[PDB]
Design a protein around this motif. Structure first.
Motif, PDB file in Angstrom:
ATOM      1  N   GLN A 194       1.192  -0.706   0.137  1.00  0.00           N
ATOM      2  CA  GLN A 194      -0.200  -0.271   0.266  1.00  0.00           C
ATOM      3  C   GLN A 194       0.782   1.492   0.353  1.00  0.00           C
ATOM      4  N   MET A 245      -8.925  11.676  -9.233  1.00  0.00           N
ATOM      5  CA  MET A 245      -9.392  10.796  -8.149  1.00  0.00           C
ATOM      6  C   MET A 245      -9.054   9.051  -7.999  1.00  0.00           C
ATOM      7  N   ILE A 246      -8.445   8.740  -8.716  1.00  0.00           N
ATOM      8  CA  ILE A 246      -7.474   7.653  -8.304  1.00  0.00           C
ATOM      9  C   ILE A 246      -6.266   8.245  -7.690  1.00  0.00           C
ATOM     10  N   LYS A 249      -6.930   8.906  -4.581  1.00  0.00           N
ATOM     11  CA  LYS A 249      -6.954   7.683  -3.510  1.00  0.00           C
ATOM     12  C   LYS A 249      -5.720   7.458  -2.985  1.00  0.00           C
ATOM     13  N   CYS A 250      -4.790   7.479  -4.199  1.00  0.00           N
ATOM     14  CA  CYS A 250      -3.575   6.788  -3.736  1.00  0.00           C
ATOM     15  C   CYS A 250      -2.516   6.764  -2.696  1.00  0.00           C
ATOM     16  N   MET A 252      -4.075   8.805   0.407  1.00  0.00           N
ATOM     17  CA  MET A 252      -4.950   8.687   1.310  1.00  0.00           C
ATOM     18  C   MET A 252      -4.004   8.326   2.248  1.00  0.00           C
ATOM     19  N   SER A 257      -7.187   2.255   3.243  1.00  0.00           N
ATOM     20  CA  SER A 257      -8.120   2.679   2.237  1.00  0.00           C
ATOM     21  C   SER A 257      -7.748   3.120   0.196  1.00  0.00           C
ATOM     22  N   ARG A 258      -6.614   3.357   0.877  1.00  0.00           N
ATOM     23  CA  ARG A 258      -5.811   3.153  -1.137  1.00  0.00           C
ATOM     24  C   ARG A 258      -6.451   1.946  -1.893  1.00  0.00           C
ATOM     25  N   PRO A 259      -5.897   2.534  -3.031  1.00  0.00           N
ATOM     26  CA  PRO A 259      -6.880   1.079  -4.510  1.00  0.00           C
ATOM     27  C   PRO A 259      -5.632  -0.050  -3.824  1.00  0.00           C
ATOM     28  N   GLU A 267      -9.852  -0.102 -13.433  1.00  0.00           N
ATOM     29  CA  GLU A 267      -9.906   1.073 -12.992  1.00  0.00           C
ATOM     30  C   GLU A 267      -8.545   1.549 -14.884  1.00  0.00           C
TER      31      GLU A 267
END
Ligand SMILES: Cn1nccc1S(=O)(=O)Nc1ccn2ncc(C(=O)NC(C)(C)C)c2n1
Length: 314
Positions: A194, A245-246, A249-250, A252, A257-259, A267
């Motif tokens: 992560q 947005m992607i 998210k990486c 955070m 919470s990250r993808p 995606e």
């Protein structure tokens, strides 16, 4: 408990390969462009020969052999292959040649010809390689656009496993790439898959901006506090809110919470089916980059018995 690593470490004779020119040199050492001509195989494999500067010391040989270990233990189309090692006084890593260099220089040098299809395809490819490393319980610790090299403009691979660790990892001092690192990695020396996702986010930002330096002008010591406040990298002009947005998210605070890389593959693949809806580039689709279906594509680097390492299986 943990599965035995049955990877084969190939020892190559110095006489079997030939250095052609220096591609680059620095802190990593010196990387040469070469050709590997095995036994009586009637093949010439384009290779990259890496050696730490020149000076032979037991400390330098340990680091390069650790890198050989990690690399011999990976087999994915989007991860650089280690063909073998040469046991000279110096000690050389023989890896597959990535003829177009790093992605960072590629996007910088070719911005006027890089379309949205290529950009999203690169993102898919990087996520696929990163997800493979995750499957193999491997934390890269140094993912950046400088470490994503180009085999062909349409095929990129993850390189430089000098920092890579086989599994959270607890590190020490030295030289760290702060502007690519997750907050936990800067403040607590915690490295996870992560934290590699955070580095992936910055790598995507590097591509989308066409090689801009992240947090340009800001000293590395200020970064930790800036991220803690809530500040992130800006939205690149070519980016739609979907792509940005992607990236966000990486970046955070909460790693969970990250993808996940498997979600990033999905995606970016959805987006790569309709690139013009997710990246707005002036002149897109009229742009041209070299492909194996171009005149003198392979001649631009003798030939006849030249085989790429991806087609040389043993
Ligand atoms: C140190 N570093 N940085 C990016 C890649 C590397 S590496 O570990 O030397 N790996 C590999 C593997 C194959 N190839 N093919 C070409 C290169 C290459 O141009 N390398 C430099 C000069 C470091 C940018 C390469 N580098």
């Amino acid at each position: 408990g943990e599965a035995p690593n049955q990877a084969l470490l190939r020892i190559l004779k110095e006489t079997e390969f030939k250095k052609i020119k220096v591609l680059g040199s620095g802190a990593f050492g010196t990387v040469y462009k070469g050709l590997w001509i095995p036994e009586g195989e009637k093949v010439k494999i384009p290779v990259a020969i890496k050696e730490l500067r020149e000076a032979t010391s037991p400390k330098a040989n340990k680091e390069i052999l650790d890198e050989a270990y990690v690399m011999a233990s990976v087999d994915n189309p989007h991860v650089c292959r280690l063909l073998g090692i040469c046991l000279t006084s110096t000690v050389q890593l023989i890896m597959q040649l990535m003829p177009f260099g790093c992605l960072l220089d590629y996007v910088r040098e070719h911005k006027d010809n890089i379309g949205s299809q290529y950009l999203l395809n690169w993102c898919v490819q990087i996520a696929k390689g990163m997800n493979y490393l995750e499957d193999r319980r491997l934390v890269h610790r140094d993912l950046a656009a400088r470490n994503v090299l180009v085999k062909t403009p349409q095929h990129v691979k993850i390189t430089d496993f000098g920092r890579a660790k086989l599994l959270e990892y607890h590190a020490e001092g030295g030289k760290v790439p702060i502007k690519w690192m997750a907050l936990e990695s800067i403040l607590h020396r915690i490295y996870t898959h992560q934290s590699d996702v955070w580095s992936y986010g910055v790598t995507v930002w590097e591509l989308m901006t066409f090689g801009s330096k992240p947090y340009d002008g800001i000293p590395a010591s200020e970064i930790s506090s800036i991220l803690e406040k809530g500040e992130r990298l800006p939205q690149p002009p070519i980016c739609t809110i979907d792509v940005y947005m992607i990236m966000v998210k990486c970046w955070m605070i909460d790693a969970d919470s990250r993808p996940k890389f498997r979600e990033l593959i999905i995606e970016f693949s959805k987006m790569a089916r309709d690139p013009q809806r997710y990246l707005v580039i002036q002149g897109d689709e009229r742009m041209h980059l070299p492909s194996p279906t171009d005149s003198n594509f392979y001649r631009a680097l003798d030939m006849d018995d030249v085989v790429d390492a991806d087609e040389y299986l043993i």
